[PDB]
Amino acid sequence: AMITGGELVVRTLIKAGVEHLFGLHGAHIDTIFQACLDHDVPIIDTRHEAAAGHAAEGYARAGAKLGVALVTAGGGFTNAVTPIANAWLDRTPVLFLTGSGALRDDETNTLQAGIDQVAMAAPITKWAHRVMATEHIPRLVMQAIRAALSAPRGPVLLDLPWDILMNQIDEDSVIIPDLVLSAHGARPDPADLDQALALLRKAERPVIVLGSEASRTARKTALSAFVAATGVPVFADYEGLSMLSGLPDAMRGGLVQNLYSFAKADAAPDLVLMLGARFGLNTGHGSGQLIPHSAQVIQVDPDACELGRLQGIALGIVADVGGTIEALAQATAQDAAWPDRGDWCAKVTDLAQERYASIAAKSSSEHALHPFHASQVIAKHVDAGVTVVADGALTYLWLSEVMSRVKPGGFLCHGYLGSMGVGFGTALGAQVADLEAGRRTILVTGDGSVGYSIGEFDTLVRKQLPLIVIIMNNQSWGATLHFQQLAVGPNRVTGTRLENGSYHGVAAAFGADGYHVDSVESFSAALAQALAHNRPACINVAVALDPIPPEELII
Amino acid sequence: AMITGGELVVRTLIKAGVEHLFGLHGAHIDTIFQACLDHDVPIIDTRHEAAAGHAAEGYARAGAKLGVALVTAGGGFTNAVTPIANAWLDRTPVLFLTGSGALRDDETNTLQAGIDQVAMAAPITKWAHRVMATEHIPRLVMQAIRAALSAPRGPVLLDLPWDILMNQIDEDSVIIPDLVLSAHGARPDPADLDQALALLRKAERPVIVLGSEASRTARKTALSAFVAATGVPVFADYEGLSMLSGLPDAMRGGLVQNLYSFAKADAAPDLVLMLGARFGLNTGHGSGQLIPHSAQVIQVDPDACELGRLQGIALGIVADVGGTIEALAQATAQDAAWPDRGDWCAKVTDLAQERYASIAAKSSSEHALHPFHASQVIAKHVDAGVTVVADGALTYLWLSEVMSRVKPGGFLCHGYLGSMGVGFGTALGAQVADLEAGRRTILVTGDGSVGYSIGEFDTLVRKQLPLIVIIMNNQSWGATLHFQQLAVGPNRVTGTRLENGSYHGVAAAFGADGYHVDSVESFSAALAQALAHNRPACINVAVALDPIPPEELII
Amino acid sequence: AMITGGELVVRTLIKAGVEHLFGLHGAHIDTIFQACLDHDVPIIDTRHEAAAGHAAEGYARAGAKLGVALVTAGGGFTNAVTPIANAWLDRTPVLFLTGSGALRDDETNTLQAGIDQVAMAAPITKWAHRVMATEHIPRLVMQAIRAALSAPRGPVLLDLPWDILMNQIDEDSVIIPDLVLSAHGAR
Amino acid sequence: AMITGGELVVRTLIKAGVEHLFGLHGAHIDTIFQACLDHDVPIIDTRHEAAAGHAAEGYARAGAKLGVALVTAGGGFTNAVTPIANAWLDRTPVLFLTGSGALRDDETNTLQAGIDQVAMAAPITKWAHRVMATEHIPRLVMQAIRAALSAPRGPVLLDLPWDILMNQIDEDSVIIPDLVLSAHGARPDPADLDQALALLRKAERPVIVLGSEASRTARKTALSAFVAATGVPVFADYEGLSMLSGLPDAMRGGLVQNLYSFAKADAAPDLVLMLGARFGLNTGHGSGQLIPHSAQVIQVDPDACELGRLQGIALGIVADVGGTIEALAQATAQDAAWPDRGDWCAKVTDLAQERYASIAAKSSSEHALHPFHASQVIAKHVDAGVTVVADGALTYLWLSEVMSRVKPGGFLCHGYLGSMGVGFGTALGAQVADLEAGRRTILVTGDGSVGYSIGEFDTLVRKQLPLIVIIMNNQSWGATLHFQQLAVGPNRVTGTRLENGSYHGVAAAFGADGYHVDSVESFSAALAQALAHNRPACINVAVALDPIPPEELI
Numbered sequence A, B: 001a002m003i004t005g006g007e008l009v010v011r012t013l014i015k016a017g018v019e020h021l022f023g024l025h026g027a028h029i030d031t032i033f034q035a036c037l038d039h040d041v042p043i044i045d046t047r048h049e050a051a052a053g054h055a056a057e058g059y060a061r062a063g064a065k066l067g068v069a070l071v072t073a074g075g076g077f078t079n080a081v082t083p084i085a086n087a088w089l090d091r092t093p094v095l096f097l098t099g100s101g102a103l104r105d106d107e108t109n110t111l112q113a114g115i116d117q118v119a120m121a122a123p124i125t126k127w128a129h130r131v132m133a134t135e136h137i138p139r140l141v142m143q144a145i146r147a148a149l150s151a152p153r154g155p156v157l158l159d160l161p162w163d164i165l166m167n168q169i170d171e172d173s174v175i176i177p178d179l180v181l182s183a184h185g186a187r188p189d190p191a192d193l194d195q196a197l198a199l200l201r202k203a204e205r206p207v208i209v210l211g212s213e214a215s216r217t218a219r220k221t222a223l224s225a226f227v228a229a230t231g232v233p234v235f236a237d238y239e240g241l242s243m244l245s246g247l248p249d250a251m252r253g254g255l256v257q258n259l260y261s262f263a264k265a266d267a268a269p270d271l272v273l274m275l276g277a278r279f280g281l282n283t284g285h286g287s288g289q290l291i292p293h294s295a296q297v298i299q300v301d302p303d304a305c306e307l308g309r310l311q312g313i314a315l316g317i318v319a320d321v322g323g324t325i326e327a328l329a330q331a332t333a334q335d336a337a338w339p340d341r342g343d344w345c346a347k348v349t350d351l352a353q354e355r356y357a358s359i360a361a362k363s364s365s366e367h368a369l370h371p372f373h374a375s376q377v378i379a380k381h382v383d384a385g386v387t388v389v390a391d392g393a394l395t396y397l398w399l400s401e402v403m404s405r406v407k408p409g410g411f412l413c414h415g416y417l418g419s420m421g422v423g424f425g426t427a428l429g430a431q432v433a434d435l436e437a438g439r440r441t442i443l444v445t446g447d448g449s450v451g452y453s454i455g456e457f458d459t460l461v462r463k464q465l466p467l468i469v470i471i472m473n474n475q476s477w478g479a480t481l482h483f484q485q486l487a488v489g490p491n492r493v494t495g496t497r498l499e500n501g502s503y504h505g506v507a508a509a510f511g512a513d514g515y516h517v518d519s520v521e522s523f524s525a526a527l528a529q530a531l532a533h534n535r536p537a538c539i540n541v542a543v544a545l546d547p548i549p550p551e552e553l554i555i
Numbered sequence C: 001a002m003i004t005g006g007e008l009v010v011r012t013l014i015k016a017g018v019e020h021l022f023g024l025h026g027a028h029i030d031t032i033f034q035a036c037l038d039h040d041v042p043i044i045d046t047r048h049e050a051a052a053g054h055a056a057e058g059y060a061r062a063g064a065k066l067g068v069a070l071v072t073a074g075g076g077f078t079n080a081v082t083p084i085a086n087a088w089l090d091r092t093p094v095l096f097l098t099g100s101g102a103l104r105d106d107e108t109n110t111l112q113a114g115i116d117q118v119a120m121a122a123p124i125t126k127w128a129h130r131v132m133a134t135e136h137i138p139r140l141v142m143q144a145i146r147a148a149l150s151a152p153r154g155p156v157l158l159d160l161p162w163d164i165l166m167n168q169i170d171e172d173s174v175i176i177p178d179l180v181l182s183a184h185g186a187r
Numbered sequence D: 001a002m003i004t005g006g007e008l009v010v011r012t013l014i015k016a017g018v019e020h021l022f023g024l025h026g027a028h029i030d031t032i033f034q035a036c037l038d039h040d041v042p043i044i045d046t047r048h049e050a051a052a053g054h055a056a057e058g059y060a061r062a063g064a065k066l067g068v069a070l071v072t073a074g075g076g077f078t079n080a081v082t083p084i085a086n087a088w089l090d091r092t093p094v095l096f097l098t099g100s101g102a103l104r105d106d107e108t109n110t111l112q113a114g115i116d117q118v119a120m121a122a123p124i125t126k127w128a129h130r131v132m133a134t135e136h137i138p139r140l141v142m143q144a145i146r147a148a149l150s151a152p153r154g155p156v157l158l159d160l161p162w163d164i165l166m167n168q169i170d171e172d173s174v175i176i177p178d179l180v181l182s183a184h185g186a187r188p189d190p191a192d193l194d195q196a197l198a199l200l201r202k203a204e205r206p207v208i209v210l211g212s213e214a215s216r217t218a219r220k221t222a223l224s225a226f227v228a229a230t231g232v233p234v235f236a237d238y239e240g241l242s243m244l245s246g247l248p249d250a251m252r253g254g255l256v257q258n259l260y261s262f263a264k265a266d267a268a269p270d271l272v273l274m275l276g277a278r279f280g281l282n283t284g285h286g287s288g289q290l291i292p293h294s295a296q297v298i299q300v301d302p303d304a305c306e307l308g309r310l311q312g313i314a315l316g317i318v319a320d321v322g323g324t325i326e327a328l329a330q331a332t333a334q335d336a337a338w339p340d341r342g343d344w345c346a347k348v349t350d351l352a353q354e355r356y357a358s359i360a361a362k363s364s365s366e367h368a369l370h371p372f373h374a375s376q377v378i379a380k381h382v383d384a385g386v387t388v389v390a391d392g393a394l395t396y397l398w399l400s401e402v403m404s405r406v407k408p409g410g411f412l413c414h415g416y417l418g419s420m421g422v423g424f425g426t427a428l429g430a431q432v433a434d435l436e437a438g439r440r441t442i443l444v445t446g447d448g449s450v451g452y453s454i455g456e457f458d459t460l461v462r463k464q465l466p467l468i469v470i471i472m473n474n475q476s477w478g479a480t481l482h483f484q485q486l487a488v489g490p491n492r493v494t495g496t497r498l499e500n501g502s503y504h505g506v507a508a509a510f511g512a513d514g515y516h517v518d519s520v521e522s523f524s525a526a527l528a529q530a531l532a533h534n535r536p537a538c539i540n541v542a543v544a545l546d547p548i549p550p551e552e553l554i
């Protein structure tokens, strides 16, 4: 009944409902590994702490739950910083548990000590803190969890000194708290809700735009009820996209990028209801290209700073997005009868079809396989049974054009950090979450990006995680090469070609199934085969570099 | 139509609804001074940036609105750090505007440059940011205001480089946004509200405890309706106390400290509804001495990390406190009649009376004026027309004993920072806010504490602000002297005596009315006279040092 | 022969050659006041921690030696920040000793706790550090002194948690180092 | 004559004497790539910013010069933080140039923006700063360089907003300064030097211990003169080891770890002259196990905080280590003849031989290749023409045992950060530096550690860098597995096995030569062949896991 600090950490995680961790071993954190071993809690151990951190993010995002990363002192922590930064900008709930130097050996120039890990994490976490006493562990672990899971979601760093973890205490002297935190988010004042709904009712061309906070709470039943009652088309940024999958086709606007062509069509929305979608990279900043300057904007976000950040708004509500969706469903449930939106929904559908058809008409695979065509091959397989994770740059810009007509179970793309290479770890953690969901995870990445975490094929094999890694291979850091050609000159390509290496050969050397394809027919055959087997796979797809995705020109 | 960055700052503040600033001049920020001059916006200029910062706090606290502090580069900023830290721990909405070195003269070892002011403020603000372009001023001022005013309220630092402020731009090249941020905070999910109310209904001995967030939103009408419907007695920490002033005597539990004697009376609450009162210094930490371990606790706070921080709770709700009070009032306006709680309210009343009577029975002014008796002299004048500000240590501990039976318009005491000296600036700012309300401000401070900001008598006279400064003079840093005697030994008093100086003489030399008193009669006469005139005053009250206040006895 | 952490602080100061401190009292740092009282080391107690900080600077500047400021947790520290910043830009050797919340009472929303004092001082000191063990006091005080006195001179913050200072340890279990640092600068 | 901020960066680097950069492309930093292209300054572009940062470290360490890393905004920067931290604790002069969000687009929730990069780097840099004006670029680049190169050396972060770099200015309106910073480090006061030499002369068993600052200034001629004049044996931590390579055998004490067995042999030094060797991980902390408590210590370090950090010292000198070595050589070229130290030097040698022989006696490759035997295979090839980079854990602990006997041109091991995986990028950068030195780089790494940066086989092949990567493969995160067995229990192994993957197969798929070996003979043949050709290679060496290196116990 004397137990370690690491045992306290794990008892507290278990009580909160944590079922998996992602990490990489060190002695500093062995007490946590030993406790997980005793309690049959899996730690998915990777080949890089960065992959472990991104895996915790992917688990959190695909699973709509807490992700937990576990890393050792010093380089364990510094190797997890890109995950922390990505989760920060993406509003992703991840508890990063890090080891650190023993307090009793402070300032001794010893192994792995002397990095101010909390100071480094401070600019990019909701909370970061170093534990000072073993008896504080349960309450601070639970406090850290509440911080991560509350609106807007985000990463937390809990730094656990080696002596604090190794110290033994009487188990009866420290209580392990429950996670007592309402699952229901706060909702708008009914006066604000009444005004929002009165405006929505009055609008001629209203749209809703979902952001990441809608994905985190996943109030799909309420969203469906609200959308069925009002008939208003719903768009989303990348992170909100999968929240559209259960909606009737007439009200699926798809990716918010599709609003670009509306003003030209004399069909700019006159009202926009933004639900956790921030003004920024995915929503056209303050340009009014997607969210028109002429529209009345109602914005709901848990962070008041975001409200009208880059554009004047009509009504700014601070509330949880999930709670708001529940409130909207309740208010419209016994409401009757909302205005018919048939013609407006049809216009949204037509503009989307026009975009897709136009791109189709400009895409040829005469010699090399066209990225649009390669994307269409993937789209044939995307439905509620699949999570798509997207990395690369040109790769995801092209992929995005096929993503609105399908209904993915999950879609996990770059957010604001736009950090090439995060997709592999992300997809690995998503595939873990997806085992419980019954989904197959497909990573669609670039040849450049895959190199960041290419050792994780080892992890997929050791852990028998059937992630399918599709590499869109244009022999280059492509978008950056386009930048050089477009912004500087045709003769100014430098540091951006990648004309070496057999990625499928690398995957095969780690024991994964390797495929190399270069055509619509070869690729479709390979992908069908990979999906039929419950095995990790690498599909190396030779694609053309020169095509310019629509979003590259728009961006 | 070319205008300065400083003019953009002021136009934005005006559009937000700011009517006063507190500050101290520097060339770095003169453009803001000149714009306020043009627009007839008063800047209350003090004798120390710390006093200006605390004044902005006091204005925010007394006024339930945004406070704005304005300080110059370098030492202007560093002199404001104590206000920032105090506002941080007290959840007080203050926008600290600071000058800083010109961007164009970066790294030139020049005057007032080279302090990383944002880094210094980061650990003690909701947001801290240095402005990079003159065009960004309106949107970032408004963003800062939204950050300060949103739940939980807190300080923000906006750092404005000299060139950014002096730079002139076309006034029409940038839009000045409105403050578009709902006045009504987010409320609990109805399931959570129903659960809370079910527990409140079933409880034998329920209490409500209000915290600072209740004061910031000041939902007095809703609170009155809720309390009348349920008959549940309401307590508060210092910052919540004035929120009890409009409640019937029967439901006024007063300061939460009064709960101490309940367990021995076999009367410990079985349910506690905490409305923005955190677990911490004012609520007995996790000791269960005020909030019993045996009670079911419903806690409502805008910061999830606070929920059950130090004690297990039954229901943890993240919502705005004002929004929650409105929700509770709405629900209890349409449910069944509530159980009569007259006997319980009477018990609450009896226990408070027993405490007060006990103190009265023990207190003697035979050889020197007793702090409890001096406190009683003040209490006779306290009602809705008075804001009481409290500083010192033993001074406020004694004062607290008379504050539950009166109904102050405002009560501003030390919060967690416990920083001796903050009261003078705080009271000065409070008196500015109180002007429009027809209220009179009284500072009750220690002889030690008053020394920190004693030059502010000058400011009171220059600005004709009729603040009454009452100095409880026990010729020592009192509570610290008690610590030495009680925790160390009777012969171990060092560095705590202050057996010098005529504070009324200092006040007089600055042109304020000075009084020196040493008895109930003399003090009563001085206070009556000072209150009869709209003149600043200093009342120097000789009081005994040896008496130990109940709150110290408990400790 | 059990002595407090505050006693360790003062014994280390005395061995370094410190003969005056400037400060303002708080319970958090009483163990240092008591040790100074015992050893007849004057603490010049002011009416504001800022004045105490600036006095430590003035003492250093006028006397070409180390200045030592002594302030309590929370507002004691925040009141000393203008002195820290002034000494930073002036290259003035001042050791700022500050109290802070007890480590054992971390994250309890308690009196004078919760300010990240080391983070606040980091941009304006040669070194700033929070002591984690009573036994570290003498070596870390001497390390801080070496940081302050070495070229270019400047301020250092040593943050001493209440429990770390109140803790008692066997005086024979920890050595008080000498100040072994050449008086002659490199050429 | 209008030129970009990026062009200003590169003109300043060139004027400082920078000849190589390491990095990974982004649009945010393209102006620097374009300028390097114009000026024929190579940027060695890697598959991960971490590898690029570590390459800049390796180039700095192996070359005793400034390393320059170049990364883009956001993830470019955050991917570089392990290099920054490693360089920080290793006292390695690296200029990290990072892009960042445009100032004009501040707070727009845009691509790669919103990370406070300078705040993140502040705890682990000598200086970190974000540039506010294009016109400031040359003076701030040069300022950053002076910060990195000055004693004690270390990393600097210069953050260059996208608009600051893209902005064009009249080239005639901004001067590009020279690097005007003396190459000569400051030296001790002659009174201090006199006292140090007086103590050194009176000592019965004096030793010298070198640290990283000695390697940074590389005052080899002076060191040789001082050592020849005094006859005092010289030890080093890992970073100071290659500074012993030009000394006569009699005064080569080798790695400072060898001091362990001296007290039990009644031979503990009575005087220790520490030259940039800190009290800490490599010197036995304050334990007295290497630096005896009974010895008088003279410590010379550019950071006063370090002087007697963990142990009482007799004389604490703040000076540059190189300047001090020059001063000591100068003084001992003019003073009287020094006492003969032949017997003490022979004791040092005998104790080192006794350690080596004891390990040799215990090591058997009967059933699997023993890590000590594998290490000896490598040692056969180590001389001035070789830089050895060491990663892994058990791997470098075993390797350390053969390193004191040989005289490497360079030896780059883990420092205080002990971050598994830094070796690959480090060795790639070292190989670049080694080109002009006429040296061949060999990385000796673990099967676990190699996985961190395994994509860099691609970079070796693209850039034709003939790095030889030797993977000591014990199918595990080995030292951590030993921890579980030794400190917890034999049935408590969890999260530490790595019983999968063909590393040589991975290297071959990237176009590098791959070998798989499992014996002294097969390993010897593969290494000999790899060394015979200027081609990148991976040698996957099957080695036993169970043996415990002496240092693991200690």
Ligand SMILES: Cc1ncc(C[n+]2csc(CCOP(=O)(O)OP(=O)(O)O)c2C)c(N)n1
Pocket (backbone or CB within 6 Å): A391, A392, A393, A394, A395, A396, A418, A419, A420, A421, A445, A446, A447, A448, A449, A450, A472, A474, A476, A477, A478, A479, A480, D024, D025, D026, D027, D072, D075, D076, D079
């Ligand atoms: C961590 C990081 N490093 C560098 C960049 C700069 N960058 C933007 S796009 C891009 C090219 C990505 O190439 P690839 O993964 O192959 O995708 P592609 O554009 O070719 O489809 C790069 C290097 C970045 N965004 N993040």
Ligand SMILES: Cc1ncc(C[n+]2csc(CCOP(=O)(O)OP(=O)(O)O)c2C)c(N)n1
Pocket (backbone or CB within 6 Å): B391, B392, B393, B394, B395, B396, B418, B419, B420, B421, B445, B446, B447, B448, B449, B450, B472, B474, B476, B477, B478, B479, B480, C024, C025, C026, C027, C072, C075, C076, C079
């Ligand atoms: C800024 C600051 N400095 C020092 C302290 C330590 N301290 C606590 S109580 C106290 C005495 C206050 O004396 P006074 O204002 O005269 O009030 P009294 O207790 O005598 O009524 C002191 C110095 C503090 N809390 N804050």
Ligand SMILES: Cc1ncc(C[n+]2csc(CCOP(=O)(O)OP(=O)(O)O)c2C)c(N)n1
Pocket (backbone or CB within 6 Å): A024, A025, A026, A027, A072, A075, A076, A079, D391, D392, D393, D394, D395, D396, D418, D419, D420, D421, D445, D446, D447, D448, D449, D450, D472, D474, D476, D477, D478, D479, D480
């Ligand atoms: C970045 C980082 N992650 C984890 C650790 C913990 N750690 C210490 S030794 C070790 C094992 C390294 O294994 P390998 O590289 O194969 O070397 P071996 O000990 O097997 O020879 C690990 C994971 C560390 N020191 N640094």
